[PDB]
Every structure is written in structure tokens, then in C-alpha cells.
Amino acid sequence: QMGFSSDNPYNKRWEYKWKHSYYTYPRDYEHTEVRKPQDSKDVPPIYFAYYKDFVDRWLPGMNMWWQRRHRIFDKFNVYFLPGMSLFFYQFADLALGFKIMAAFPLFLAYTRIRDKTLDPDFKETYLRDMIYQNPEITKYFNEETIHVLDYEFEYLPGYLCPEKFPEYQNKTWQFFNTDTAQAEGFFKFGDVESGATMTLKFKTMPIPGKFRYQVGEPFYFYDLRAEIKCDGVYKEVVLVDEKESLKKIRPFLFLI
Amino acid sequence: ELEELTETHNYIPGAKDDVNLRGYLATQFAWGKKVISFYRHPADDFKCAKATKNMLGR
Amino acid sequence: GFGCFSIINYLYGRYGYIINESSQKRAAQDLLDNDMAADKILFKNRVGAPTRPLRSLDDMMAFLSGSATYDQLADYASYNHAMDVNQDQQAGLDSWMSEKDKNMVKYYQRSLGKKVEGI
Amino acid sequence: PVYANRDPETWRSAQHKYSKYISNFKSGDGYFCIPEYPYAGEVECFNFFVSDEVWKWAQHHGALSPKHTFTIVNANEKFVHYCDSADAFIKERLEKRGIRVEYNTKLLEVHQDGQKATFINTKTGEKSVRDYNNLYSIVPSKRQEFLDKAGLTNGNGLLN
Amino acid sequence: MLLVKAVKVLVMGGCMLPIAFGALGTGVLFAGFNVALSRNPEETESLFNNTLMGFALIETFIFMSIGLGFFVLFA
Amino acid sequence: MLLVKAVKVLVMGGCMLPIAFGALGTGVLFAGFNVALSRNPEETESLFNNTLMGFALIETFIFMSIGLGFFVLFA
Amino acid sequence: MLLVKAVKVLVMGGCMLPIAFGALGTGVLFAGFNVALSRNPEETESLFNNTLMGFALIETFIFMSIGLGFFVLFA
Amino acid sequence: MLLVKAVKVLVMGGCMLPIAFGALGTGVLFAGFNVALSRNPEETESLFNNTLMGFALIETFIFMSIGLGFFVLFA
Amino acid sequence: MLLVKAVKVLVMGGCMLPIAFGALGTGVLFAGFNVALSRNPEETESLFNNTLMGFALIETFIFMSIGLGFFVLFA
Ligand SMILES: CCCCCCCCCCCCCCCCCC(=O)OC[C@H](COP(=O)([O-])OCC[N+](C)(C)C)OC(=O)CCCCCCCCCCCCCCCCC
Ligand SMILES: CCCCCCCCCCCCCCCCCC(=O)OC[C@H](COP(=O)([O-])OCC[N+](C)(C)C)OC(=O)CCCCCCCCCCCCCCCCC
Ligand SMILES: CCCCCCCCCCCCCCCCCC(=O)OC[C@H](COP(=O)([O-])OCC[N+](C)(C)C)OC(=O)CCCCCCCCCCCCCCCCC
Ligand SMILES: Nc1ncnc2c1ncn2[C@@H]1O[C@H](COP(=O)(O)OP(=O)(O)OP(=O)(O)O)[C@@H](O)[C@H]1O
Ligand SMILES: [Mg+2]
């Protein structure tokens, strides 16, 4: 699901990505059809630029934090950092060093809230390169003729089944995280040439790569399935199977 | 067209002209002879920055 | 770092005497014990100035280990008139000094704002 | 993830794979293989006590998956042949730490494609293939024939 | 006491000696860069990079001493 | 008192030491530039920019010294 | 007593002398590496490594001096 | 007073140190100009210009010290 | 007594003079190695061994000085 969304009807999955060069916001939202001069309001009201920045930049940004608030309710953000901020706030008048140690855990909480509330962005260029390498998909789909009908990608809530992923049953990791950092979604594709359609379901999880402490890929497709549908032919392609991918690599269990 | 350059704050002379001949006549004897790049806006800044294992991004 | 350095520097101001107050009391009396010993072994001319600190090895150490030795000698050398007199003594003009002339430096120290007794 | 006791001659100063055996063990089955005596590096190459302590920290904060297996595949029946007191302490400390051992088994083959390691129990002659993700083995030795053609070595291949 | 304080402030002045050698070490390094550049101007990148990297280590010692200076001046 | 002040002013004189090494490091830098220039004059511009650039970093330390000079002299 | 203490802090300042020479010796070494690179840039990694290695040996003397400093400063 | 002035004038004498290094750097600068000229005399005027340019940056440090000298001598 | 002890401590600091010269000598030797290495890298092993050997001879004098220092410091 897309968290950052305004009343603009076009380009929903690109609204947070596109950086417009506008000085202020357009008078009216992008029109879906040709309208009449009286359909819009000339000389918009006073303080209109400040109103737009609130309902087009601030409000959709707060709806994101509210939509994904279930990912920040961990014991570290809720109890540790605020309690650490209060212990030094009682001594803020003694010296400047206490003001800093009382505000740092709050700026740290915002950073974790900021990063955790963003929409999960995978490397889509790695994905399209992966499917365009499969002959069963390129048989019906090509980049010059493919179009997106629907897109959904959101984190999975809470801890998962503690038999397929026993890693998340760690009280030290749970103290910092209340979610899993995994995401699940699909891709509705269509080809204007062959008329084919397919639902590209996929699951992702962060993995370690080639290093000790740093994550290798926060969104690694360990399950990638495509249910291709054509004029009268139905195919099911398995680019990445989870039963064979989970035997080689395990999640990363982000901390902080 | 002059109002379009003003209202968009494209007040760098000759930015939107493919051949800014007026820009070459003024720079015939200038140091670091150069003309403004095509469609250069006085507000855009494409500056980047990176941190490497060495200092100063090297 | 700024938070910790500003904190420990505060604790060292509020607290700290718990472990260093002894070293200050020791140096306080020591700074007075060595000064009293300097006045015992030091050449003072008709004014209270240690003009011969290098007379012997024991005088060099007593002059350096003292606190007021630097001032009694610096104030004597910083007094224009006192050095004009000495410049005349070197030429052969000298005489006896009264109790008021002997304290020409104490008057000079008082003028600068010093706390000097024995006028 | 296949590691050994020495560095090959094809590596330059910019290669540090030797240092990743302990660090890059995020998950999977680990094997520490000991060849058949006589071999070089009896005690100066046993790093399964430092790895356990380092791999003990990973399991505390989740860096190392909880479903991992590390076992010592010893071809020989004992670690230190000519010192029982030393070998007794090792076998005693391995148990206190919680490490598993398999004697009379020596590594035989390594498949770099699917990460398959073929082991064989010299005592029973029964071989098996096991998936690995972090493998360490002390390079095995080999007796030279020119010392046997002259009639100098005795048995194992050492000088008499 | 008062003299030891005088030596402390004096040592702080001695810290300006690396500052002098750092200047000479800089001109020497850039003097070689010029020559090294004329000999083979194709590899400007590497030469130029290694130059500043050296300049870094040179000035590193400079500020290291400055720290040592204030340290002795107050400790 | 009078001794320490005499040392403070003394250290202020020490700051003129880098000023000396900066002069030598400067002549050496331009000495090499002339050689580097005569070696390959086609790339004069590159040598020249790098020449003056190094000089900037050289007198930068010199200015930095004067800072410490007045600091101890008044702090 | 205090006289010896004055020399203790004075010797501590003297430790900034290798710091100055270490800075100059750094520029000289890297100045040569620049020229050596233009000459035969095929062995960058080799020459580059030898440069940092030699430098490490320099800081060894530097830290050695500082260690010697605090030693005589307190013993 | 006079004693502080005595160390001020003493510092004022230190200003002659860059005046000394400036002479050596000058000789080195023109030394390179000569050898560099021999290798490529086709660009004499170019070298000559950069030669005198460097000698100016030398006196820049020199006059700077004399300024610093007279200042602290009276301030 | 207290004076000769101060000179003993003073001489102990003087040992850091070879330390400075040794640091500068290190860059020079390694500089000659790098440049000499680029000119003939086929025999890097030979030049490299000779380099460290010389560096060892340098530390000989270094340790000799410190040895001399501690000696006169207590003898
Ligand atoms: C206890 C006394 C209170 C002390 C005063 C505290 C004031 C708090 C409110 C004012 C400061 C708000 C932050 C301004 C800085 C961020 C600017 C911004 O909006 O960017 C949005 C950005 C928008 O993203 P963007 O700016 O990076 O751009 C997005 C991409 N493009 C440009 C392409 C569109 O989103 C966010 O930053 C996340 C939401 C920010 C949350 C800010 C805090 C809001 C607090 C709401 C309080 C609600 C309860 C109380 C009020 C109830 C009302 C009745
Ligand atoms: C008595 C006064 C108290 C004041 C409190 C301290 C506030 C700071 C001092 C006042 C300054 C106010 C004016 C400055 C406006 C901000 C300017 C700015 O640059 O900000 C842009 C930033 C943008 O940050 P950004 O990371 O999103 O993007 C910028 C990226 N760089 C830095 C590279 C450019 O947005 C912010 O406002 C961050 C600071 C917000 C501070 C909020 C403090 C509270 C933390 C959240 C509480 C969470 C509690 C956890 C509970 C459990 C979870 C459910
Ligand atoms: C009159 C009243 C109002 C006055 C207002 C001020 C008007 C100023 C007029 C414009 C001045 C522009 C100076 C630009 C100089 C660039 C020359 C050049 O391209 O170098 C070519 C030079 C020479 O190449 P050349 O080919 O162009 O010229 C050759 C010259 N001859 C013929 C002699 C051989 O080569 C270089 O690239 C060296 C670049 C060095 C750049 C150093 C200058 C930096 C200063 C600019 C930054 C200032 C930013 C200030 C921002 C402040 C914000 C608060
Ligand atoms: N190789 C790069 N070099 C310089 N800047 C980069 C590079 N890669 C990314 N950046 C910057 O980091 C930003 C984030 O990169 P990111 O791959 O997440 O974008 P993306 O739109 O999600 O790509 P994709 O469609 O494949 O998912 C980019 O917008 C870019 O500004
Ligand atoms: Mg993406």
C-alpha cells in the first residue's frame, strides 16, 4: 500500500518519488478531463500556498506515520529513549551536556520512525531484469509493450511463524523491533501486443551480503511467482522458490 | 517570450537560445571563454557529495 | 562527546575536592614553607629585591621554588626610578637610604594595586 | 565459504578471505575437518575455540541463525597423539562448550557448485554427502616417494 | 610554580615548529606533483588524489601537536 | 606575572618561524613549476592551477599560526 | 624540585620535534611516490602499499616519542 | 616595562628569520628557472613571468612578518 | 643535586632528536625505494629487502640513543 497519497488522481506509486520543481503547488489538482473556466476558481483564496503545502505535503506525510505506526511500538522507542530523555532533562539547567543527552534519544527516535514509516522501496530495476531473462515471460511480455494495472507492496505485521523463521524469536531483537521487516505484494501486468496478463506475486526479506555488520539487500526476493494468463493459455512460472532459497540464506534481523 | 523568461526566473541571458550568438560576442576576449549551458536555470543545483574510505571524497 | 565532556567537567567543578583537596592544602602550605625558607637564604639589598639569585646553587633553587621572589624582583626591575638609581650606583654615586627610600618598591607595588604591608 | 589453513599463492595483498571464516558464518552447517595424521598444524591451527566464543555473540543478537550446526570432523581418533593431557583437556572443553565431534571421518570431496561435501568414515568405509555453508580444513600432507625409494622413511612416511 | 606555568606557555609556542615544516612539506609535495604531472599528464587523477592524501597525513601531525600543546598548557 | 607576559610575547615571535619556511616552500614550489613547465608546456593550465592551489594551503598554516600566536598572547 | 619539573614539561614539548620532521618526511615520501607513479603507473598497488607501510614506521617513532614524553613527565 | 619591551624588541629581531629563508628560496627559484629555461628556451618569457610571480609571494610572507613585528613591538 | 638531575632529565629529552631525524630519514629511504622500484620493478624483492635492512640500521642508532639516555639518567 502507498502511504504518501494526496487527492491527486494520477501516478499514485510515483507521488513520493517525483520531485517537482514547482515554486508552489498548482492551483488545481491534475485534471482527469477538460473542464470549464467556471469549474475552477480564479485568483485562489488568500494563504492558499500555505494551505496546499499542508494538505499536499504535511498531511500525506502524517498519514504515512499513522498508517505504519505498528512498526515503531517497540520497547526501545517507547520506554528506553523517552526514559533516557527524562533522566537528563531534570539536569538540563546544570549544564549544556545534559540538554544534548536529553535531545539525542529523541532525534534518534525520529530517525527510526522516519526510516521505518517510509514505503518499502525495492530495487525494481533488478526485478525487471530478472523477469526479462526468463523465456517463458518474454514470450508474452516486453518492456516496450508492458503496462502496470495494479501494484501493492507492504510490510508484514508482527512476528511470523516460529518454525519457518525461528530467527525472530530473539528477545534481544524483539526489544528493538515489533515487526519483521518483511514485505509481501504482487504486480498486475499486461502486454498490449500479446494481450497477456499475469500476477507477479513476490515475498521479500532483508539478507546479509559479503560483509559482517551491514545488510546486503534489504529486499531480497526469496519467493517470486508468476501466474501468466493469455488468450486461452494459463501458465505458472516460478522464478524463485522459497523452499530452496531459505536453505541458503536467512534474514538479517535489523537492530536500531 | 520575454515575459516567459521573467515569470520562470530564467534571467540568465541566452539560456533558452540554442545559439546564443550575443553570448559569444561578449566573450570574444573573456577569461575562461564559455557560454551558459542550454536551458540553465539560475536556481537549479545538481551538486553531489560522497564519503569514501579516503578523505575529501577521494 | 560534548555531552560527556560538559558533564564530567561539571562534576569536577561541583565535586572533585573529594580526591584533590588534599593536594591543594599540601601545595598551599608548601608554597608558604618554601617562601619562608627563601627569605632565610637570599641576598636582599637595601630594598627587598633578590638581586643575587645565582650567588650559589642553593639560592638558584630557593629563588625558583618561591612565589613572591619573581614579583619582588620583577617590580624592582619594572620601576623606572629604581633602575635609574642603580644605573647611577654603577657609575659611583651612592649613599645611605632612609626608611622611606628603602620602601620605594612597596610604594610602587601599592600604586599598581598590590597588597603590600610594612610602609 | 570454503576455507583452509594456508593462503594460496594466487592471492595478492588486497585479498583477505582468510579473515571471513569466523565473521561470515551468518547461518548454515559448519564443518571443521582434520586430516589423517601425520599432518602439519596440530595445535597451532585449532581455531574452533575462538570461533565458538565469537559465534556465541552472534546468537545473542541474531547475527547467527539459531538453526546452525558446527561439528569437528576428525579423521584421527585423537587430536593430540603424543600428549594425552592436552588431548584430554580439549575433548573435555569441547563438551563443556557444547561442540559435537565425529571421529574416523575425513573429508573426501568438495562440490563448489551446490556446496556439497562428501565425507567418509574410514572405520566403517561408509561415505555421505552433507550440505555446508562454512567449511574449514587443515591441508592434508603427503609422503614423498624419493624418500621411500632410498629406504629412509618408516611406515607413515616420516624419517627413521 | 610560576616558572612551570611560563614553560607551559612556552611549549605552546614550540608547537608552531611542525606548522613550519608542514608548509615546507606541502610545497615540496606540490612541487613534485607538478613535475610528476608534466612527466605523465595522462594519470592526473591518481597523482592528484595521492597528493591530497599525503597532505592529509602532513597536516594530521600538525593538529595532533596543537592538541598536545593545549594539553600541556592545561595539564 | 611579568615573566609569563614576557613569554607570551616571546611565543608571538615564534610564529614568524613558519613564515620563513613558507617562503622557502614557496620558492621551491615555483622552482619545480618552472621545471615541470619547461618539461611539458602543453599542459600549463593544469600545472598552474595546482601550483597556486598548493600555495594556498601553505599560507593557510601560516595564517593558522598567527591565530595561535594572538591566542596565547591574549588567552 | 620544581626546576626538574620545569624540565619535565619542557621535554614534553620537545616531543613535537619529530612531529614536525614526520610531517616533512611524509611529503617527501609522497612527493617521490607521485613521480614514481608517473614513471611506471602499472604498479600502483605495489608502490601505494610501500608508501603507507613506510609512513606507518614513521608514526611508530612519533608515538614512541610521545610515550617517552609521558614517561619522563611522570617518571 | 622595559623588560617586556626587551622581549618585544627581541621578538622584533626574529622577523629577520623569514628574511633569511626568503633569500634561499629566491636562489632556489631562479636556479630552477635557469635549468628549466635551458631545456625549453622557446618559452623564456613564460618562465620569466612565473619566476618573478613567485618572488612576490615570498615577500608577501616577508612584509607580513615585518607587520607582525612592528605591531607586537608597539601593541 | 637538583640541578644535575634537571640536566639529566634535559638530556633525556635530547634523545628525541635522532627520533625526528630518523622519521625524516625513513621517508627518504622509502622514497628512493619507490622511485627505484618503478625504474626496475622486476627485482622488487631485492630492493625491498635492502630497504627494511637500512630501516633496521636506523633504529639501531635510535635504540642506542635511548639506551644512552637512560644510562646518563641514572649513571
Ligand atoms: C508540547 C508543545 C509542542 C511543541 C511544538 C511542537 C510543534 C510540532 C508541530 C510543528 C512542527 C511540524 C514539523 C515541521 C517540519 C516537517 C515539515 C513537513 O511537514 O514535512 C512533511 C514531510 C513531507 O515529506 P517531504 O517534505 O520530504 O517531501 C515529500 C516528497 N515530495 C517533495 C516529492 C512531495 O513528511 C514528514 O516529514 C513526516 C510527517 C512529519 C511529522 C511532523 C510532526 C507533525 C505533528 C502533528 C501533531 C498532531 C497532534 C497534535 C496536533 C493536533 C492538531 C489538532
Ligand atoms: C523546550 C524546547 C524543546 C525543543 C525540543 C527540541 C526541538 C529542536 C529545537 C527547536 C528547533 C525547532 C525549529 C527547527 C525545525 C527543524 C529544522 C530541521 O532541520 O528539521 C528537519 C528534519 C528533517 O530530517 P530528515 O532526516 O527527515 O531529512 C533531512 C536529512 N538531512 C539531515 C540529510 C538533510 O525534520 C525534523 O524535524 C527532525 C527533528 C524533529 C525533532 C523532533 C523531536 C522529537 C522526536 C520524535 C519523538 C518520538 C518519541 C518516540 C515515542 C515512541 C514512538 C511511538
Ligand atoms: C561593477 C559593479 C558590480 C560588480 C559585481 C561583480 C562583477 C564580477 C564580474 C564577473 C567576475 C567573474 C570572475 C570569474 C573568473 C573565472 C575565470 C576563469 O574561468 O578561469 C579560467 C582560467 C584561465 O583560463 P581562460 O582561458 O579563461 O583565460 C586565460 C587567461 N589568459 C589569457 C591570461 C591566459 O583557468 C582556470 O580555470 C582557473 C580557475 C581559477 C578560478 C579562480 C576564481 C574563483 C573565483 C570565483 C568564485 C567566486 C564565488 C563568489 C560567491 C560569493 C557568494 C557569497
Ligand atoms: N549509482 C548511483 N550513483 C549516484 N547516486 C545514486 C546512485 N544510485 C542511487 N543514487 C541515488 O540514491 C536514490 C535511491 O536509489 P534507489 O535505487 O532506491 O531508487 P529507485 O527508484 O527505488 O530504483 P528502482 O526503481 O530500481 O527500485 C536515488 O534516487 C539516487 O539519487
Ligand atoms: Mg525502488
UniProtKB/TrEMBL annotation, chain A:
Binding-site residues for ATP, renumbered to this chain: K17, K123, E124, T125
Origin superkingdom: Eukaryota
Binding site residues for Mg(2+): D121, F122
Protein keywords: ATP-binding, Membrane, Metal-binding, Nucleotide-binding, Transmembrane, Transmembrane helix
Membrane-traversing stretches: 72-89
Listed name of the protein: Transmembrane protein, putative
Naturally occurring in which organism (per UniProt): Tetrahymena thermophila (strain SB210)
Automatic annotation (TrEMBL), chain B:
Taxonomy, superkingdom: Eukaryota
Locations listed in the record: Mitochondrion inner membrane
Family recorded in the similarity comment: Belongs to the ATPase d subunit family.
Record's protein name: Uncharacterized protein
Species, as recorded: Tetrahymena thermophila (strain SB210)
Lineage: Eukaryota, Sar, Alveolata, Ciliophora, Intramacronucleata
Shown chain mapped onto the complete sequence: 177 to 234 of 234
Automatic annotation (TrEMBL), chain C:
Keywords linked to the UniProt accession: Membrane, Transmembrane, Transmembrane helix
Name of the protein this chain belongs to: Transmembrane protein, putative
Top-rank taxon: Eukaryota
UniProtKB/TrEMBL annotation, chain D:
Domain of life of the source: Eukaryota
Chain ranges of the FAD/NAD(P)-binding domain: 69-160
Binding-site residues for NAD(+), renumbered to this chain: N5, E44, C45, Q144
The protein, known as: Oxidoreductase, putative
Whole-protein coverage range: 161 to 320 of 480
